[PDB]
Amino acid sequence: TSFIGAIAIGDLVKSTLGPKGMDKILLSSGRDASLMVTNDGATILKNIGVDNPAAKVLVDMSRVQDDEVGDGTTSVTVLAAELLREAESLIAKKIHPQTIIAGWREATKAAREALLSSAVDHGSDEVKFRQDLMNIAGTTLSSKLLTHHKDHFTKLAVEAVLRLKGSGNLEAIHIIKKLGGSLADSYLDEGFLLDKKIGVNQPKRIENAKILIANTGMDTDKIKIFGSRVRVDSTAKVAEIEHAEKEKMKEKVERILKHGINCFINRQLIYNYPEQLFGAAGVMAIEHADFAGVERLALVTGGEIASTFDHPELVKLGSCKLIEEVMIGEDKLIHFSGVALGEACTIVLRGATQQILDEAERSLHDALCVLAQTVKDSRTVYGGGCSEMLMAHAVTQLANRTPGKEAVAMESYAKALRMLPTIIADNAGYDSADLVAQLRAAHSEGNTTAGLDMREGTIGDMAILGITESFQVKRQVLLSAAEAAEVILRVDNIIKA
């Protein structure tokens, strides 16, 4: 069928594209009292109700490989939609779809080669890494309103990610959702933090932190084969419900004490009467835990992962040397002093608002990701409109050399890719056509580093401004948009059950 849906989804995502974009408001059906305003197009794509099967398959083909790299969604979706619209114009001009597919395959190969050629290596120098990481953090943390708080995110994320120096710790990084103080400052945990209370019933500075890593926690109780003597036999003795609770507590707590561990971590909140039971028994159960905490304990101190814990050897003697708690925010938060930074980290923000912290954590997730692979990688390319328009220029150049009818499809690809910085300018309110045409002139006459400076709406020599985008995310968004546009285009008719 015709691509009305594939361009409709792109149009509804377009105005959110990049910083200084346009917001969207999403509200629940039924006229209930619930709505939210968001700028990240990924949020709209997550919350969108895809009534068009073409739009559904487009957003699904994005989701498998767009949220992985981070922030590509607002670029891949819009580029794919513009490609589909230009190809709809082409098929209106009687250009067969397979010609367009071949032309776009070759054009994407050329654009990726041009991107690799234009990509600049920045390894082996620490200061270049520092400046590049702050620049890429600022470009990825382009979402918060407060510019000083923007810089706060930039510095915190950069210093959290750089201290690795090795293979990725993105599996171990976390951003704690605990509410703190001012909504304009950020923080990082010298030892990963939990929302668990400390001191009232458990020791403060826990030397010899055993850190048993449990999954099957006590919602109310557990069991061990002992020969229970239950007093609540039937409905005739409902008043004796408490009798078995003490046994079901002790017949596990005692054996865990013989295992040598009081540091029982589990996801499940051990209740107030069980709080009395555990506290008196001399076990410091931590009622919140996760896969991330266990794997951070593993990576930082040579530990391991466990599951279905019943047997003592099935979990590690996670001999953390000592654990304390810190006073950030309006809670008594345990703070694992033993697991020092350098191998892994966890970021915590101060601020008393969940909904702001939502966009915050989304932006830090996409950042932490791109930061992780670009440290794993070594190359980056000039961001803004410079990179995409450079690839569009390369596609235009090789398109002119193409003899086949797919030359028109190649030119259409170049125009669609050129439309992305056009949308960047349009969302920023500048004269889109003038900006994009003068950019085409500015880096078509050589001057490959020239880019569009969105901060003032003028031509900007991107070499010294420092606004750069990591090579991996650009290559991934290029290839993903190409393949998604191929998938959407190459289907001509649809049938339904």
Partner 1 sequence: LMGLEALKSHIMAAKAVANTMRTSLGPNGLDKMMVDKDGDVTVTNDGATILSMMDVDHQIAKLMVELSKSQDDEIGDGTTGVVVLAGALLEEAEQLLDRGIHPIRIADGYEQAARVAIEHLDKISDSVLVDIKDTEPLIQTAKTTLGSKVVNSCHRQMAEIAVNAVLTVADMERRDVDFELIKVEGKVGGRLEDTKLIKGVIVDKDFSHPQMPKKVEDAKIAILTCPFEPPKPKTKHKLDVTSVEDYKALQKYEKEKFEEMIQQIKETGANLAICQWGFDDEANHLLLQNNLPAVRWVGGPEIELIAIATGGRIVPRFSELTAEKLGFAGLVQEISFGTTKDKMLVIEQCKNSRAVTIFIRGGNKMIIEEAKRSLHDALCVIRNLIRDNRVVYGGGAAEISCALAVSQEADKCPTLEQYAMRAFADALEVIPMALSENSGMNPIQTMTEVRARQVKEMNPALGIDCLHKGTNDMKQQHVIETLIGKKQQISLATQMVRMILKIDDI
Partner 2 sequence: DKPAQIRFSNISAAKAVADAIRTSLGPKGMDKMIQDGKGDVTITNDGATILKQMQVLHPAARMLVELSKAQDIEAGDGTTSVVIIAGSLLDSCTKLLQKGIHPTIISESFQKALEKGIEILTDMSRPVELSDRETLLNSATTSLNSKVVSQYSSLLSPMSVNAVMKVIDPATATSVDLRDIKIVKKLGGTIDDCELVEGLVLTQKVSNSGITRVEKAKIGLIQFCLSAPKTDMDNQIVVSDYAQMDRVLREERAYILNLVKQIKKTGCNVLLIQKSILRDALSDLALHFLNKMKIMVIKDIEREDIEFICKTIGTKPVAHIDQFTADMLGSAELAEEVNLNGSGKLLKITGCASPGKTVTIVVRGSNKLVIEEAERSIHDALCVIRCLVKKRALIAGGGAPEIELALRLTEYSRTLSGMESYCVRAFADAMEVIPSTLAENAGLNPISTVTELRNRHAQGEKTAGINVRKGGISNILEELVVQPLLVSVSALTLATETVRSILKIDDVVNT
Binding site per annotation, positions for ATP: 18, 72-74, 469, 474
Q: Which residues contact 227 (CB under 8 A, 6 or more apart)?
A: none
- CA angle (124, 125, 128) in 5-degree steps: 130
User: One symbol per residue from 196 to 225: x for binding partner 2 (CB under 8 A), - otherwise; what is it?
Assistant: ----xx------------------------
- Indicate whether 76 belongs to the interface with partner 1 (CB under 8 A): no
Strand stretches in 304-393, DSSP E: 320-326, 333-335, 346-349, 379-382
Instruction: Using alpha carbons, select from 42, 14, 125 the residue that is nearest to residue 416.
Output: 14
The answer to whether 217 and 249 have CB atoms below 8 angstroms apart is: no
Which one of a copy of itself, partner 2, partner 1, none is in contact with 452 (Cβ closer than 5 to 8 A by kind)?
Answer: none
- Element (DSSP H or E) covering residue 208: strand 206-209
450-489: contacts with partner 1 (CB under 8 A): 487
Quick one: 71 or 426, whose CB is closer to a copy of itself? Answer: 426
- Indicate whether 326 belongs to the interface with a copy of itself (CB under 8 A): no
Which DSSP letter does residue 337 get? T
Quick one: 102 or 463, whose CB is closer to partner 1? Answer: 102
- Indicate whether 93 belongs to the interface with a copy of itself (CB under 8 A): yes
Distance CA 127, CA 484 (A): 38
* Shortest spacing between CB 144 and partner 2, in angstroms: 14
28-57: contacts with partner 2 (CB under 8 A): 28-29, 31, 33, 35, 37, 39, 44, 47-49
- Residues annotated as part of the active site: 40, 73-74, 366
* Shortest spacing between CB 436 and a copy of itself, in angstroms: 8
Which one of a copy of itself, partner 1, partner 2, none is in contact with 403 (Cβ closer than 5 to 8 A by kind)?
Answer: a copy of itself
Specify the residue for token string 């590049």.
132
- Indicate whether 444 belongs to the interface with a copy of itself (CB under 8 A): yes
- Element (DSSP H or E) covering residue 494: none
303-362: contacts with partner 1 (CB under 8 A): 310
> In angstroms, what CA-CA distances link 439 with 71, 195, 386?
24, 51, 8
Determine the distance from the C-alpha atom of residue 126 to the mean position of all C-alpha atoms in its chain, rounded to a whole number.
Answer: 26
User: One symbol per residue from 431 to 450: x for binding partner 1 (CB under 8 A), - otherwise; what is it?
Assistant: x-------------------
> In angstroms, what CA-CA distances link 237 with 221, 229, 232, 234, 408?
20, 13, 5, 6, 85
- The count of residues in the chain is 497
The answer to whether 109 and 391 have CB atoms below 8 angstroms apart is: no
Which one of partner 1, a copy of itself, partner 2, none is in contact with 92 (Cβ closer than 5 to 8 A by kind)?
Answer: none
Quick one: 83 or 283, whose CB is closer to partner 1? Answer: 83
- Indicate whether 228 belongs to the interface with partner 1 (CB under 8 A): yes
- Indicate whether 238 belongs to the interface with partner 1 (CB under 8 A): no
* Shortest spacing between CB 405 and a copy of itself, in angstroms: 4
Total of residues contacting partner 1 (CB under 8 A): 30
CA Rg value for the chain: 28
* Shortest spacing between CB 221 and partner 1, in angstroms: 17
Instruction: Using alpha carbons, select from 418, 376, 370 the residue that is nearest to residue 393.
Output: 418
Distance CA 336, CA 193 (A): 7
- Indicate whether 125 belongs to the interface with a copy of itself (CB under 8 A): no
Quick one: 282 or 404, whose CB is closer to a copy of itself? Answer: 404
Quick one: 228 or 447, whose CB is closer to partner 1? Answer: 228
Give the other-Cβ count within 10 Å of 321's Cβ.
13
259-288: contacts with partner 2 (CB under 8 A): 272-273, 275-276, 279-280
User: One symbol per residue from 7 to 46: x for binding a copy of itself (CB under 8 A), - otherwise; what is it?
Assistant: ----------------------------------------
Quick one: 327 or 429, whose CB is closer to partner 1? Answer: 429
- Indicate whether 378 belongs to the interface with a copy of itself (CB under 8 A): no
Total of residues contacting partner 2 (CB under 8 A): 42
Strand, coil or helix: 451: strand
> In angstroms, what CA-CA distances link 269 with 43, 289, 362?
31, 10, 27
The answer to whether 388 and 414 have CB atoms below 8 angstroms apart is: no
Give the other-Cβ count within 10 Å of 425's Cβ.
23
Q: In this structure, what token pair is assigned to residue 121? A: 């290596």
Residues contributing to the annotated binding site: 18, 71-75, 142-143, 384, 469, 474
The answer to whether 130 and 375 have CB atoms below 8 angstroms apart is: no
- CA angle (424, 353, 171) in 5-degree steps: 70
- Indicate whether 229 belongs to the interface with a copy of itself (CB under 8 A): no
User: One symbol per residue from 384 to 413: x for binding partner 1 (CB under 8 A), - otherwise; what is it?
Assistant: ---------------------x--------
Q: Looking at 48-96, list the stretches that DSSP marks H as alpha helix, in order from N- to C-terminal side.
A: 53-63, 73-92
Specify the residue for token string 């629940």.
28
Instruction: Please give the residue ranges that form the binding site for partner 1 (CB under 8 A).
Output: 53-54, 56-57, 96-99, 102, 227-233, 236-237, 310, 405, 431, 487, 490-497
Instruction: Please give the residue ranges that form the binding site for a copy of itself (CB under 8 A).
Output: 93-95, 396, 400-408, 431, 433-434, 437-438, 440-442, 444-445
Instruction: Please give the residue ranges that form the binding site for partner 2 (CB under 8 A).
Output: 11-12, 15-16, 20-29, 31, 33, 35, 37, 39, 44, 47-49, 200-201, 235-239, 241-242, 272-273, 275-276, 279-280, 426-429
